[PDB]
Write a protein that binds this ligand. Structure first.
Ligand code: TTP
Ligand code: CA
Ligand code: CA
Ligand code: CA
Ligand code: CA
Ligand code: CA
Ligand code: CA
Ligand code: CA
Length: 325
DNA sequence: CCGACAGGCGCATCAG
DNA sequence: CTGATGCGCC
DNA sequence: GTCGG
C-alpha cells in the first residue's frame, strides 16, 4: 500500500514494544517520529545511510533499516514476536483502560487472554470493564457516512439543550478522512470563558444519554467527557458497533487553540508543539504563550484564527486535510 | 556527563 | 482531608 | 532513540 511501508510498519511495531513492554515513552516517540518522517519522504529508501539524513533518524534506526533492506525482516522483532510474555503485555494494552503498567501486572498474575479478562472481571475497574465489553467494536473503524449521522444527532441534540452551544466534530473527520477511530466533539458556550460549573457539559451529556445516543461513561469531569455512543439501528438489521466518543468543553474565547489540538493528527501536534519550544513558545489546548529565560510561560498571545498560531512559529498554514500522515 | 523529549483532564494511590 | 506522583488517555 | 552539542 505505502512506499516505505515495510520500514514504517517495522518502526511502528518497535515503537509499540517500547511503549507497552519496556515502558520507555520517549523511545516510543523516537520510533514514531522516525516512522512519520519516513512516511512523508517521497523517495524509495535504498539504504540506512539515506534514511539517517532525515531528521529523527539516527545510527541505530539506520542499522535496523539496513538489516530490513538486506534480509526483509528484523531479528529483534522476531524475538519479540515469539516471546509470549511480551505478546500478552502488548495485547492487553489494546483494551481501553489498560496501559503498560496494568497489562504487566495482569500478566504477572497469569492473566494473558480475553478469556482470562472475562473470567476475572472482578479485578478490573469501570473504565476497563467497558473496554473489555466493547473490545471488538472499538477495534473497528467508523465510515464517514456513519460519522455524518453521528454529527447530525449530536448537533441537533445540543441545539435542543441550548441554541448558543456550538459543537464541532474534530479528529480525523475534520481532516476529511474516509474513516475514523472515534468521534471527537469540541464544545463551547458563551457562559464559559477563560475569565468566568454551570453544568454546561453535564446537560449535553444527559440529553445525549436521554435519547440513548450515549450508552456508557468511561470518565466524566466538568470540562472533559469520555465514553461510548451508538447510532440508532433499524428493524431486522444487526446493530451498529458501539463507538468511542470524547466531548471537550473549551472556553469560547480560546476556541482556536482548542480546535487546533483536537483536529490533529497526534504526531502533527507533537511536531508543532516541539517546534513551538524551539521558537520560544509553548502551546496547549487553551493558549500559546512565550517562554521565559527559565522556561516559564508568560501571558497568552492574541489568537483569533488557527493560522495565527502557525504564524507565531513561522509555519506555512496547513489545512486540516494536510495535517495527516 | 546528563537532559529534554507536548501538555493537561480525570481518576487513583500513597504519605501524612 | 491535601499535596505529590503516576496511569491511561486525548 | 535522537538531537543538542
Ligand atoms: C491520541 C493523541 C491525540 N492527540 C490529538 C490529535 C487528535 O486529532 C485528537 C484526538 O483524536 P484521536 O481520536 O485520539 O485520534 P484521531 O482522530 O487523530 O485519529 P483516529 O481517526 O484514529 O481517531 O487529539 C494528540 O495530540 N496526541 C495523542 O497522542
Ligand atoms: Ca503517506
Ligand atoms: Ca538525522
Ligand atoms: Ca489501552
Ligand atoms: Ca478520532
Ligand atoms: Ca478520541
Ligand atoms: Ca443494544
Ligand atoms: Ca489574524
Amino acid at each position: 500500500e505505502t512506499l516505505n511501508g515495510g520500514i514504517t510498519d517495522m518502526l511502528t511495531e518497535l515503537a509499540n514494544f517500547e511503549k507497552n513492554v519496556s515502558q520507555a515513552i520517549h523511545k516510543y516517540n523516537a520510533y514514531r517520529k522516525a516512522a512519520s518522517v519516513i512516511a512523508k519522504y517521497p523517495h524509495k529508501i535504498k539504504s540506512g545511510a539515506e534514511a539517517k539524513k532525515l531528521p529523527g533518524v539516527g545510527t541505530k534506526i539506520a542499522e535496523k533499516i539496513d538489516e530490513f533492506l538486506a534480509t526483509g525482516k528484523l531479528r529483534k522483532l522476531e524475538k519479540i514476536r515469539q516471546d509470549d510474555t511480551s505478546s500478552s503485555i502488548n495485547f492487553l494494552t489494546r483494551v481501553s483502560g489498560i496501559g503498560p503498567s496494568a497489562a504487566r501486572k495482569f500478566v504477572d498474575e497469569g492473566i494473558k487472554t480475553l478469556e482470562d479478562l472475562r473470567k476475572n472481571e472482578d479485578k478490573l475497574n469501570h473504565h476497563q470493564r467497558i473496554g473489555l465489553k466493547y473490545f471488538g467494536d472499538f477495534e473497528k473503524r467508523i465510515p464517514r457516512e456513519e460519522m455524518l449521522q453521528m454529527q447530525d444527532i449530536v448537533l441537533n441534540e445540543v441545539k435542543k439543550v441550548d441554541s448558543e452551544y456550538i459543537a464541532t466534530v474534530c479528529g480525523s473527520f475534520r481532516r476529511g478522512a474516509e474513516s475514523s477511530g472515534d468521534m471527537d466533539v469540541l464544545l463551547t458556550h458563551p457562559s464559559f470563558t477563560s475569565e468566568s460549573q454551570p453544568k454546561l457539559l453535564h446537560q449535553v451529556v444527559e440529553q445525549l444519554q436521554k435519547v440513548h445516543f450515549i450508552t456508557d461513561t468511561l470518565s466524566k469531569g466538568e470540562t472533559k467527557f469520555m465514553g461510548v455512543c451508538q447510532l440508532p439501528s433499524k428493524n431486522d438489521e444487526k446493530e451498529y458497533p458501539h463507538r468511542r466518543i470524547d466531548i471537550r468543553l473549551i472556553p469560547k474565547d480560546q476556541y482556536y487553540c482548542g480546535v487546533l489540538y483536537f483536529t490533529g493528527s497526534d504526531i502533527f501536534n507533537k511536531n508543532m508543539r516541539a517546534h513551538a519550544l524551539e521558537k520560544g513558545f509553548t502551546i496547549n489546548e487553551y493558549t500559546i504563550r512565550p517562554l521565559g529565560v527559565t522556561g516559564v510561560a508568560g501571558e497568552p498571545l492574541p489568537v483569533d484564527s488557527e493560522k495565527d498560531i502557525f504564524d507565531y512559529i513561522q509555519w506555512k498554514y496547513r489545512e486540516p486535510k494536510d495535517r495527516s500522515e
